[PDB]
């Protein structure tokens, strides 16, 4: 019994276990999770269509909005469901060979698969409406998406380990996520905001990731200066190393 096989078995068990809780018992969670993006699409198209037309006459609003909104939804879902993974299955730690990291990565893979399904469905229904859906450069888009996924999972694991025996921190990080919706410039193009506040907004790694994903997805998309992948890549690597180190240091205390 090598550790890899039992790890895979318990990961599959936790994954389907999470899938049962997250999705509805009547197999209807997909309906709400598909309603979440379309409401934002509707309100932003009815609220900022002419503003985007004044912004640039090159890319239509729906595809440009989806290609940034869905990765942001993946990021926020990874952070939120990863920070609550350990303090949701306290009883399941009674069995041997369970561990908390297995729970957090089962939730991570469930969120990744679900949001990948949502992204594929959105791309399909976008191509069914006569829009442009095929990525011009798919390899760079895949790399950017992988970096964003790693950053989100790392931040979620860090918040899960650090904020043990203090639920109240979990209450405030969520309120930190709300301005990040507008700071990241997912809704409106960042080319319109004046440079007077650009550098303070260049410290958001998800901003760089979103612009690079849009640049790799669209043909002839102008990326402004200081949107290198090096800064979010280093941020993700450092945060992942820090979170893994903190989990390794506090291992038996997290199980309880």
């Amino acid at each position: 019994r090598s550790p890899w096989q039992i790890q895979q078995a318990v990961l599959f068990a936790l994954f389907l276990r999470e899938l049962k809780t997250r999705l509805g018992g009547r197999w209807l969670g997909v309906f709400w999770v598909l309603l979440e993006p379309v409401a934002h699409i509707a309100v932003m198209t009815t609220l900022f269509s002419l503003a985007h037309r004044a912004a640039m006459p090159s890319i239509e609003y729906p595809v440009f909005l989806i290609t940034g909104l869905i990765p942001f939804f993946m990021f926020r879902g990874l952070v939120t469901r990863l920070m609550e993974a350990i303090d949701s299955n306290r009883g399941l730690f009674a069995y041997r060979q369970v561990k908390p990291i297995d729970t957090v990565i089962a939730r991570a893979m469930l969120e990744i698969s679900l949001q990948s399904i949502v992204y594929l469905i959105a791309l399909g229904t976008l191509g069914w409406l006569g829009f442009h859906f095929l990525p011009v450069r798919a390899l760079e888009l895949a790399g950017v998406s992988a970096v964003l996924i790693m950053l989100g999972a790392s931040l979620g694991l860090f918040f899960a380990v650090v904020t043990n025996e203090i639920p109240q921190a979990r209450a405030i990080v969520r309120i930190s996520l709300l301005p990040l919706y507008f700071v990241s410039g997912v809704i409106f193009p960042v080319h319109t905001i004046p440079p007077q506040y650009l550098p303070l907004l260049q410290l958001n790694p998800v901003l760089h990731l979103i612009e690079l994903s849009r640049a790799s997805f669209f043909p002839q998309y102008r990326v402004l200066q200081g949107i290198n992948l090096a800064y979010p890549a280093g941020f993700a690597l450092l945060s992942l190393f820090l979170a893994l180190m903190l989990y390794r240091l506090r291992r038996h205390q997290l199980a309880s």
Partner: protein, 226 residues
């Protein structure tokens, strides 16, 4: 082979660390039945949980090359919103048991439980006896080298207790058992050696009667203290 190497376990209290075990190193005898006896709060239940893997020691470790079961009849490891069939299926996936084996395991638990349509209903609607029955069935579902009991013979009704006793009598000769019971008749009948837990220290007696006499003398000494 079961060994506790440098096992130090404490409880967090406002007045400091309430130490239960301090550098406990002890080797259990092999292929024999063990009766874990001791005073109330001496540390029998927490040592049983440490053996079963429910709670990890603060310091040291437990080294074992044989399967150690969870507390038989414990309903704390279940999910209230999940039904018994899916619960025993999940426990099967925990130990990596094959599909055919899981099927019979599920059938065996369902037949032993004798619950009925509520077997497709979740534990939040179950009572204490129903939870005890399904926990007992999920405990017998796997062939453990060592089975752990802490007063699990008093659960259920008379018929369920008789069925459990007959099953364990059939089991005797195939697997070992660690029993924590205040009734020394059960220790004499079912256990071959005695382990006395006192002041964070474990003492092994190859004779059950000698260990019972030692525990009774310890109780008398504790009662004689002013």
């Amino acid at each position: 082979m079961i060994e506790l190497r440098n096992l130090t376990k404490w409880y967090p209290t406002p007045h400091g660390r309430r130490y239960v075990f301090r550098n406990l190193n002890f080797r259990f005898p092999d292929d024999v039945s063990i009766g874990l006896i001791g005073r109330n709060g001496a540390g029998k239940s927490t040592l049983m949980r440490l053996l079963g893997g429910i709670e990890a020691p603060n310091e040291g470790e437990v080294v074992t090359d044989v399967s150690i079961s969870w507390p038989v009849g414990l309903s704390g490891g279940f999910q209230g919103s999940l039904t018994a069939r899916e619960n025993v299926k999940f426990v099967c996936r925990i130990y990596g048991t094959s599909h055919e084996d899981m099927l019979r395991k599920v059938r065996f638990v369902e037949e032993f439980a004798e619950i009925g349509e509520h077997f497709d209903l979740p534990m939040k609607t179950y009572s204490s006896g129903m939870r005890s029955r399904v926990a007992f069935g999920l405990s017998m579902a796997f062939d453990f080298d060592y089975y752990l009991i802490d007063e699990a013979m008093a659960v259920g009704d008379a018929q369920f207790r008789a069925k459990s006793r007959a099953v364990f009598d059939s089991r005797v000769g195939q697997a070992n058992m660690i029993l924590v019971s205040h009734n020394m008749n059960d220790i004499k009948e079912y256990c071959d050696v005695v382990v006395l837990v006192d002041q964070g220290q474990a003492t092994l007696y190859e004779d059950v009667e000698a260990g019972i006499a030692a525990y009774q003398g310890s109780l008398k000494k504790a009662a004689a203290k002013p």
